[PDB]
Design a protein around this ligand. Structure first.
Ligand code: 2GP
Ligand code: CA
Length: 104
C-alpha cells in the first residue's frame, strides 16, 4: 500500500524522507536546481492544516524513485520546514491550475 498517494503515483515514507533529505540540504546550502528554483518557499495559499510550523519549503518528489536534480519536476512535492520536519506531501494532480491538493 502507499503511505502517500498522489494521483496515481505511489510513495512510501522512505521515498518522502529521501526527497526531503535532498531538499533540506540544498536549502541549508542556499542552492537551487531546476527552472523553478527548487527548493523554494511554499506560501500555503491552499491553507492546509500542517501539524508543524512554518516557514515551509517545497521540493519535488519523483515517481521514478530518483532524487530531483533538475529537468521536469513532475506534479508532486514534499513540504518540509526550517527544522527539517515533514509537513506533508502534495500534488498538482487533480487540482485546478497551479493549485495543490494533499496526497492521500
Ligand atoms: N499553489 C501554490 N503555489 C505556490 C505556493 N507557494 C508558492 N507557489 C508558487 O506560486 C506560483 C503559483 O502560480 C508558482 O510559481 C508556485 O510554485 P510551484 O509551481 O513551484 O509550486 C502555494 O502555497 N500554493
Ligand atoms: Ca518508492
Amino acid at each position: 500500500a502507499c503511505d502517500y498517494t498522489c494521483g496515481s503515483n505511489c510513495y512510501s515514507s522512505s521515498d518522502a524522507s529521501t526527497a526531503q533529505a535532498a531538499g533540506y540540504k540544498l536549502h541549508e546550502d542556499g542552492e537551487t536546481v531546476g527552472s523553478n528554483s527548487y527548493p523554494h518557499k511554499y506560501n500555503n495559499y491552499e491553507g492546509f492544516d500542517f501539524s508543524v510550523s512554518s516557514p515551509y519549503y517545497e521540493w519535488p518528489i519523483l515517481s521514478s524513485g530518483d532524487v530531483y536534480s533538475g529537468g521536469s519536476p513532475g506534479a508532486d512535492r514534499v513540504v518540509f520546514n526550517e527544522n527539517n520536519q515533514l509537513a506533508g506531501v502534495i500534488t498538482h494532480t487533480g487540482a485546478s491550475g497551479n493549485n495543490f491538493v494533499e496526497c492521500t
